[PDB]
């Protein structure tokens with residue numbers, strides 16, 4: 001029952017530390033690791049983790065390429081990236097490319113832990129500061145409309161499941177289907193869209 005996390009990076013000491021941090025929280029767990037983008041895309045697709053942690057600082061300068069390719073697959077979880085830096089343009093680019101959030105490698109262990117846990121097993125809404133960025137870039141089953149409404153509120157898969165009295169597996173199936181259906185690449189984008197048009 002703990003939330004699953006897929007780690008994609010090629011930065012040993014960072015992964016070593018992140019693993020230690022994840023051990024401090026029983027309700028979250030690492031389901032897979034990958035030091036190669038291609039391998040990571042394979043694991044992402046077959047495991048469909050609640051959280052995919054991607055490092056954009058990977059060798060070959062193809063971190064943003066792996067993101068495009070992940071966003072091509074049918075995923076129902078969240079993708080949080082380790083930004084190159086805290087510069088506005090490095091951040092907005094990641095979000096525009098399909099990431100739900102971003103983290104910095106120089107965060108304090110205590111704060112990083114809270115961020116990973118929130119992204120994997122908690123509520124997570126985009127800050128108003130970054131909302132216009134996604135807004136700039138921007139046939140539904142009754143059950144899917146219910147799921148979309150809750151997604152707009154930032155609820156994770158598990159909370160949505162225990163709310164609509166459905167199994168988490170069917171939630172994931174519904175999320176990836178209506179997402180790929182409505183031409184939406186991420187959950188934050190789905191949330192921003194809904195609020196933009198005030199569907200609810």
Ligand SMILES: [Pt+2]
Pocket residue numbers: 020021024
């Ligand atoms: Pt710790």
Ligand SMILES: [Pt+2]
Pocket residue numbers: 024
């Ligand atoms: Pt601890």
Ligand SMILES: [Pt+2]
Pocket residue numbers: 024113
């Ligand atoms: Pt701790």
Ligand SMILES: [Pt+2]
Pocket residue numbers: 121122123159
């Ligand atoms: Pt919750």
Ligand SMILES: [Pt+2]
Pocket residue numbers: 121122158159
């Ligand atoms: Pt919860």
